Amino acid sequence: ISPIETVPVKLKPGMDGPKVKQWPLTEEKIKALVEICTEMEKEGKISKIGPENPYNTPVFAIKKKTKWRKLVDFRELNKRTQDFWEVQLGIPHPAGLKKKKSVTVLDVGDAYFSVPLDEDFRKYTAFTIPSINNETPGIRYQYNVLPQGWKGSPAIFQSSMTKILEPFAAQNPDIVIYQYMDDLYVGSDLEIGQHRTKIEELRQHLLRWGLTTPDKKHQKEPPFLWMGYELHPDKWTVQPIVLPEKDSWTVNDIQKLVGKLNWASQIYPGIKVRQLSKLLRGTKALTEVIPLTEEAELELAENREILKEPVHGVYYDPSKDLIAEIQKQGQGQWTYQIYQEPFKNLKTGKYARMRGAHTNDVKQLTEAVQKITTESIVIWGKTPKFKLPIQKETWETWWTEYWQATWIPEWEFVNTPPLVKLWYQLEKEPIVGAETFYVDGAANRETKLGKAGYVTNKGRQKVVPLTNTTNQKTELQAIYLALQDSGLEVNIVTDSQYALGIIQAQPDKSESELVNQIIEQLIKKEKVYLAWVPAHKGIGGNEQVDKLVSA
Amino acid sequence: IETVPVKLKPGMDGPKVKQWPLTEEKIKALVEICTEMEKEGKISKIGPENPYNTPVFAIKKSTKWRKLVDFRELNKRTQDFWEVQLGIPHPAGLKKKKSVTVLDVGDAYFSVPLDEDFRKYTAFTIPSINNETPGIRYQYNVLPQGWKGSPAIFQSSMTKILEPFKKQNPDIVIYQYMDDLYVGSDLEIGQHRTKIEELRQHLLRWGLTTPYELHPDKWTVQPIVLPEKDSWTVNDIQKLVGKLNWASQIYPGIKVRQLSKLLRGTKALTEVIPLTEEAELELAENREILKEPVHGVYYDPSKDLIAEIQKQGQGQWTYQIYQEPFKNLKTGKYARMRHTNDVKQLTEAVQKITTESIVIWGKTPKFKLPIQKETWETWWTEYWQATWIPEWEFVNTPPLVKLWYQ
Ligand SMILES: N#Cc1cc(Cl)cc(Oc2ccc(Cl)cc2OCCn2cc(Cl)c(=O)[nH]c2=O)c1
């Protein structure tokens, strides 16, 4: 008996409606509920019910410091209500919106109260206004419309709005309507007056279905404060960032901080958050005080300077190409912009994941491309052209020798250093006239003491003692020792599957300082060939250095 | 017609899987396909009271797009209905035949109606761009392709339609896995393709529309190969010693003593060591132990199949199928003679391995893919042609076992 058709709702199988008792309230708060309810009753939103209804749900009356508002705690009913199709978890990104001649923002008043609720489900919405000091029975009501705070209200409203919009959307194909919560965002490339006429039509079309909308004098005007953004007619930017200054930082303080910095990364180029993020590694409690690293202090200072200036993003033109450009900012940190025209950026972003203890630059550049690809698909529905500071010779060599399959987009080389390059390449065949080191390392797991040694074809032998290490860390330090005491060309032979795997991956940045030192040596060297042999199998050079390090 | 009652395993809820973002090209193609599928009554729009979801993809099997539904989750939650109950048994002879042709018979399912209670579980979503719209929500009214209960429900009709043809040809083996028929014969090639065309026309005259053959006789477990140099270096012997030591876990009896002896001392890797007569025999003897096949390796039907893939460079990709480590039911190599790229070759290799696995055991293996998760999730449909989808995970550790299987 409502124009809008209801969605059938069921409780989770085997559950009944909520039977929560109502807490007593003031005679003044009861006065607020009684008046609000008779208005809601007059409006058909709610109905008084007989005594046979066995369900209840608490109701409260609050006000802010001033007409009162009614509040219903549906927590128990929500637990017993079936699941619904998930409403929009994500929201549109301003850089994905297409530029429109005119844009109108309409909010729906009493949105949920304008949609009928399934008849068979209404019994479970019963609530009670308390009588003064239990002097009499309370007044039993139930809901006939979507209650605010009920589990199913957002999804059923959105679907009801969709169907209500379908007739108008047919008779007006050029008008574009976006839905979000109780809002409609309408855009046309028609004349401001013509567009203004169409808006007024949609308002009446919604009013005929019962949906209140604002008039031309009460409609919001640009700039729109929408979900932490500023939407101007020809520009978007984030709302102002306020990074606090503090003498001491809690874990929660840093999590707020990286969040705001992450938020600034979409339009502010060059934001970095790695050093600050490392502080939260193993962050036990939110109240735990974290001493700031010198690196985190510099990172935060660098962020403050970038934020001092103001930046804006532009809206999207489907007719112009989409181009993405990546720049390296520092060891492990990358930055990108996406643009259709040279200096008009649609959005910016960063990528700074190590994805492991050790990595190389070409691998990280490929990962940054992958992250942009996923992001472009989400926002614009396609992948962009890539302008990258790497040469085809560099990338081709890497992706050919790399043991993983990888997709290399179509990209052009842009000579704007720092250019991504391979700092070193291990030899693929052993070296003639280069000394052959047989390295080994050992560590007592209990005492945690160790040693790393080498034996060479030229007869050279050496053992260095190690204080606090592991079998793995010594196997790496043995390779470091051979690199330290070798000429510009060296053949190294290890029995360590661990150390071979780290080196064969050819990293150029690591979070282990020992590996960073091996990396520094590998660069200075002209030719390095690394060989592996099964340990404890009596191979000539491995047996000698094994016996040497074991003594 | 009469619907067959379908139930999920008791105490099991429907699928609630995330729909992947898609390019505008694939979205438009999905809206065209689904608009006409809706006109034909095969799917219907659903309301918010349906919370279930199954991902959908747009591929090409080709100027025309086609819809592919990833029913992997719904299949896991329906396994009582398509296995144990209404299970289709797997013939052990299909692998033995000399030619096998694969026939897409999936269009049959859209005649049969689906249990009205079970329809809510087939819900899928055509995604929007940039979350500008709520997705378009449908559920299936007929037996959907990709759901393992569809061939199980249709199994009776298929046996009936094939009963005359199997009568006329008693030595031809026909096996159905999901949306496809596998037809095997020991006949001559041109004679085999004639029988395939006969069966096709038989199917078409009974209303089952159908749109490169396999040869399982050639397949086998590859034997480990050892090099043959005219002059061996210290480094060459070391790698030869390491490869034989790795194989000592699978084949017992490989000896390295005479080979290790040639490396006694602290020699330069580049030094040229002559192959002594005693070591040449050990290398020669070990070349014969690798010729013989392993023993004790039996397929357990209760256990998952596992497929590992290594990139060997130059378009070559080795692979091993097993259930317990170092017990390889099948090994093999794939070769792309192509315009190609790494993702295209891996995608093609995965389909070859899965088809081989379907022929031999009647189920798809679980893949350990040497690729980054998000890269595979972005481009795997660009070359995906099969109507099924195997399970996969992403191996981030490199194979130092790359040159072993090389
Ligand atoms: N608040 C708010 C808000 C939220 C969303 Cl999700 C969209 C929105 O607006 C549009 C709505 C529909 C379309 Cl089709 C384009 C829009 O904008 C495109 C970009 N733009 C924005 C403004 Cl403000 C403008 O004056 N001119 C213009 O070209 C408004």
Answer whether the bond into residue A465 is a cis peptide, omega within 30°: no
Residue in B119, B122, B113 with CA at minimum distance from that of residue B154: B113
Burial annotation A138-168 (CB, 10 A radius, 16+ → b, else e): bbbbbbbbbbbebbbbbbbbbbbbeebbeeb
Which residues of B are less than 8 Å from A533 in CB distance? 238, 241-242
Q: Report long-range pairs for A90-93 (Cβ below 8 Å, ≥24 apart).
A: A90/B131, A91/A180, A91/A227, A91/B131, A92/A178, A92/A180, A92/B130, A92/B131, A92/B132, A93/A266, A93/A347, A93/A378, A93/A379, A93/B130
CB B112 within 8 A of CB B1: yes
| Same domain (yes/no): A497, A407 | no
CATH of domain B93-117+159-213: 3.30.70.270
DSSP states along A355-420: SSSEE-HHHHHHHHHHHHHHHHHHHHSSPPEEEESB-HHHHHHHHHH-SSB-----EEE---SSPB
| Same domain (yes/no): A328, A348 | yes
Give, in order, the Cα–Cα distances in Å from B4 to each of B64, B113, B150.
33, 9, 10
* Residue minimizing CA distance to atom 17 of ligand 1: A97
Q: What atom in ligand 1 is closest to the CA of residue A223?
A: 23
Give, in order, the Cα–Cα distances in Å from A355 to each of B165, B396, B402.
57, 10, 22
| Same domain (yes/no): A247, A388 | no
* Cross-strand bridge partners of residue A235: A232
**Quick one: DSSP state of residue B133?**
S
Which residues of B are less than 8 Å from A10 in CB distance? 49
Contacts of residue B155, Cβ cutoff 8 Å, sequence gap at least 6: B86, B88, B176
Residue in A312, A302, A289 with CA at minimum distance from that of residue A261: A302
What is the CATH T-level fold of the domain B5-92+118-158, as seen in this structure?
HIV Type 1 Reverse Transcriptase; Chain A, domain 1 (3.10.10)
Question: CATH code at A465?
Answer: 3.30.420.10
Instruction: Name the experimental technique.
Output: X-ray
Cα A287 to Cα A285: distance, rounded to the nearest angstrom: 5
Question: CATH code at A124?
Answer: 3.10.10.10
Is the CB of residue A224 below 6 angstroms from any atom belonging to ligand 1? yes
**What are the domain boundaries of chain B?**
5-92+118-158, 93-117+159-213, 214-299, 300-405
Give backbone dihedrals phi and psi of A113, rounded to 5 degrees, phi first: -75, -5
| Same domain (yes/no): A492, A382 | no
Helix (H, G, I), strand (E, B) or coil at A285: coil
**Contact: B245, A537; criterion CB under 8 Å:** yes
Question: CATH code at A280?
Answer: 3.30.70.270
Cα B152 to Cα B86: distance, rounded to the nearest angstrom: 5
Q: Which two tokens stand for residue B293?
A: 């096949």
| Same domain (yes/no): A462, A475 | yes
Contacts of residue B367, Cβ cutoff 8 Å, sequence gap at least 6: B307, B309, B350, B353, B390, B391, B392, B393
| Closest approach of A298 to chain B, Cα-based (Å) | 32
| Same domain (yes/no): A199, A148 | no
Cα A249 to Cα A297: distance, rounded to the nearest angstrom: 12
Q: What atom in ligand 1 is closest to the CA of residue A99?
A: 28
Positions of chain breaks in chain A, given as the residue before each break (C to N > 2.5 Å):
65
CB A390 within 8 A of CB A362: yes
Residue in A110, A108, A106 with CA at minimum distance from that of residue A43: A110
Topology alike, domains B5-92+118-158 and B300-405: no
CB A91 within 8 A of CB B133: no
Q: Is A381 on the interface with B (CB under 8 A)?
A: yes
* Residue from A403, A406, A495 to probe the interface with B (highest B Cβ count within 10 Å): A403
Nearest-Å Rg of the Cα atoms of chain A is 34
Q: Which two tokens stand for residue B384?
A: 């995906």
CB A309 within 8 A of CB A92: no
Q: Is A410 on the interface with B (CB under 8 A)?
A: no
Cα B14 to Cα B8: distance, rounded to the nearest angstrom: 8
Give, in order, the Cα–Cα distances in Å from A508 to each of A57, A415, A516, B106.
62, 21, 8, 51
The rounded Å distance from CA A112 to ligand 1 centre is 24
Domain boundary among A372, A389, A423: A423
Helix (H, G, I), strand (E, B) or coil at A333: strand
Domain that holds residue A49: 1-87+113-153
The rounded Å distance from CA A207 to ligand 1 centre is 23
Cα A126 to Cα A58: distance, rounded to the nearest angstrom: 9
| Closest approach of A159 to chain B, Cα-based (Å) | 7
| Same domain (yes/no): A3, A118 | yes
Q: Residue A440, exposed/middle/buried by CB under 10 A (0-12, 13-18, 19+)?
A: buried
Is the CB of residue A228 below 6 angstroms from any atom belonging to ligand 1? no
Residues in chain B: 406
Q: Is A9 on the interface with B (CB under 8 A)?
A: yes
| Same domain (yes/no): A214, A274 | no
Contacts of residue B211, Cβ cutoff 8 Å, sequence gap at least 6: B61, B104
| Same domain (yes/no): A298, A390 | no
**Quick one: DSSP state of residue A89?**
S
- Nearest by CB: A7 against B49, B260, B370: B49
| Same domain (yes/no): A379, A298 | no
Give backbone dihedrals phi and psi of B51, rounded to 5 degrees, phi first: -90, 0
* Residue minimizing CA distance to atom 7 of ligand 1: A185
CB A377 within 8 A of CB A96: no
* Residue A215, annotated as binding a ligand: no
Give, in order, the Cα–Cα distances in Å from B305 to each of A388, A489, B82, B346, B362.
41, 46, 19, 18, 11
- The count of structural domains within chain A is 5
| Closest approach of A239 to chain B, Cα-based (Å) | 20
Residue in A50, A51, A46 with CA at minimum distance from that of residue A59: A46
Which residues of B are less than 8 Å from A504 in CB distance? 398, 400
- Nearest by CB: B130 against A378, A431, A500: A378
Task: Number of helices (H) and strands (E) in chain B: give both, helices first.
Answer: 10, 15
Q: At what angle do helices B149-168 and B189-205 cross, to 10 degrees?
A: 120
Task: Number of helices (H) and strands (E) in chain A: give both, helices first.
Answer: 13, 25
Q: Is A68 on the interface with B (CB under 8 A)?
A: no
* Residue from B130, B237, B343 to probe the interface with A (highest A Cβ count within 10 Å): B130
Question: Quick one: B300-405 is in which CATH superfamily?
Answer: Reverse transcriptase/Diguanylate cyclase domain (3.30.70.270)
Q: Are strands B306-311 and B366-369 parallel, antiparallel or unpaired?
A: parallel
Annotated binding site of B for Mg(2+): 104, 179-180
| Same domain (yes/no): A2, A146 | yes
Contacts of residue A155, Cβ cutoff 8 Å, sequence gap at least 6: A84, A85, A86, A87, B48
What is the CATH T-level fold of the domain B214-299, as seen in this structure?
Alpha-Beta Plaits (3.30.70)
**Contact: A457, B50; criterion CB under 8 Å:** no
| Same domain (yes/no): A33, A102 | no
Give, in order, the Cα–Cα distances in Å from A23 to each of A54, A55, A69, A70.
17, 15, 18, 15
Cα B196 to Cα B169: distance, rounded to the nearest angstrom: 11
